[PDB]
Amino acid sequence: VKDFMSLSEQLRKQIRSAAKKNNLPFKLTCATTRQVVNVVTTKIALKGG
Amino acid sequence: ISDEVARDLSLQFKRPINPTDQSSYIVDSVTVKNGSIHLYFDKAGQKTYERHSLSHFVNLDNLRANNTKGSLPINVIVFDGKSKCEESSAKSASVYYSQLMCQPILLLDQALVSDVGDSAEVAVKMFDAYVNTFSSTFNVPMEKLKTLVATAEAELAKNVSLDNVLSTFISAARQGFVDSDVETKDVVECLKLSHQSDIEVTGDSCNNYMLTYNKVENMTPRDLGACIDCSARHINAQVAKSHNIALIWNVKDFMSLSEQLRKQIRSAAKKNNLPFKLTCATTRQVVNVVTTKIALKGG
Amino acid sequence: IKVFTTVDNINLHTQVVDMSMTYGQQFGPTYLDGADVTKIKPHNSHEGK
Amino acid sequence: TFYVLPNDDTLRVEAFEYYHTTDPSFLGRYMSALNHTKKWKYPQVNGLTSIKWADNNCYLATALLTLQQIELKFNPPALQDAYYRARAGEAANFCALILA
Structure with a gap:
């Protein structure tokens, strides 16, 4: 919830629209725990330099 | 002019007057850059922010409402948010200082300020704690x-990463006091997890009891x-208390567990007020106990 | 040889000793099941004790 | 039944970094096998997983039984988590990974 609040409104709307278009279920939580599971993922960060 | 004074002035002058601004506002987020601290708050539905030096934030007691100095260098007041008593009085007390400074006063929760206190030598403090x-x-x-x-001081002057410096420090120190099977990375990770989760660590054998x-x-x-895989067992709390048995688990196996499970186990232990420590040992102690082996209802 | 050592008798601790010298010459006063081993050199069967 | 996935070299490089396998066609075969293996059922006997006979799964079940009783660790964290889930009853994904 707090991270979602830190986001911009347009970004939230775009993310939700994309999720709904791709038929992807999505939920929110107040917990501070992380789902450490096996997934091929790329960290969202700046490029190297 | 604020509402708390506008009414009194209108009563004195026998005619209505219009206040110009509110007495105080509440800060919601903090950003620190280049030795300065930024405070953010919402005013009339719009985001607002200010910038101030971090130097004045070292002494939190100087910014308390009950300061006997009688003057505020900055328009920021630090108060405990969880303390419902003093947070209510802070709103009323802010009026006098706002009139003295002729501008609104910023309300800041104490916990955030406590988190604010930061430097580059905090890593050195953490190293000293380790x-x-x-x-x-x-x-x-x-x-x-x-x-x-003293060697690590020159290493810190070189501004090397904490991990490598601590690894070299422990590798040099471990000679003559640590068994060969133990690895430096295990000690470093255990120290980091102990500091972050506030857990005590001992080198004794584990028991894997719950x-x-x-x-x-x-x-x-x-x-x-x-x-x-770890072959854990269950035991009664009072029986363990009678024999003075603490919760001992291997640091690597405990780390392999999920965050929620570790938090729940720690919460249960603290509720039962049971000592608990992690260890790097790979052996199990043998004590006279009555325990039930945890297993599925396989069939 | 590799042998086990402990204080609370349930913990996990292990020591490695050489068979050239006695237990006492390397560590000191040591006993095993009521038998003094301070002035006795180990053999193969003492492994794992 | 067939499945189609586009090509992305960056994703395959990340998959190799995670799983230590250089096969560029690993992902598609793995998904195709996993989809078929999800159809199966895996009951348990005496706390040990049992499988109804299908598609010559006898040696796979024997390997599962062998793994259930031996000390075992893996370098890929994903494979280790898959083994953890398999020992808890989610053997389909682990078997699919082994076959892939």
Whole structure:
């Protein structure tokens, strides 16, 4: 919830629209725990330099 | 002019007047850059922010409302948010200082300010805490530790990463006091996890015991498989208290567990007020106990 | 040889000793099941004790 | 039944970094096998997983039984978590990974 609040409104709307278009279920939580599971993922960060 | 004074002035002058601004506002987020601190708040539905020097934030007691100095260098007041008593009085007390400074006063929760206190030597403080924990674990004579810390001071002056410096420090120190099977990375990770989670660490043998309150019905399959691998057992709390038995688990296996499971286990232990420590040992102690082996209802 | 050592008798601790010298010459006063081993050199069967 | 996935070299490089396998066609075969293996059922006997006979799964079940009783660790964290889940009953994904 707090991270979602830190986001911009347009970004939230775009993310939700994309999720709904791709038929992807999505939920929110107040917990501070992380789902450490096996997934091929790329960290969202700046490029190297 | 604020509402708390506007009404009095209107009563004195026998005609209505219009206040110009509110007395105080509440800060919601903090950003620190280039030795300065930024405070953010919402005013009339719009985001607002200000910038101030971080130097004045070292002494939190100087910014308290009950300061006997009688003057505020900055328009920021630090108060405990969880303390419902003083947070209500702070709103009323802010009026006098706002009139003195002729501008609104910013309300800031104490916990955030406590988190604000930060420097580049905090890593050095953490390193010193790790060294103290290691010394308490092994009771090495002070002079060798002081020489190694003197070397680590030059290493910090080189501004190298904490991981490599601590690894070299422990590898140099581990000679003559640590068994060969132990690895430096294990000690470093255990110290980091101990500092971050506020957990005490000992080198004694583990037992892999748990209480009945950690019900298996809520277990995820992955954590249940991990428990099967570690071969944990259940025991009554009072029976363990009678024999003065603490909760001892291997640091690597405990780290392999999920965050939620570890938090639940720690919460249950603290509720039952049970000592708990992690260890790097790979052996199990043998004590006269009555325990039930945790297993699935396989069939 | 590799042998086990402990204080609370349930913990995990292990020591490695050489068979050239006796237990006492390397460590000191040591006993095993009521038998003094301070002035006795080990043999193969003492492994794992 | 067939499945189609586009090509992305960056994703395959990340998959190799995670799983230590250089096969560029690993992902598609793995998914195709996993989809078929999800159809199966895996009961347990005496706390040990049992499988109804299908598609010559006898040696796979024997390997599962062998793994259930031996000390075992893996370098890929994903494979280790898959083994953890398999020992808890989610053997389909682990078997699919082994076959892939």
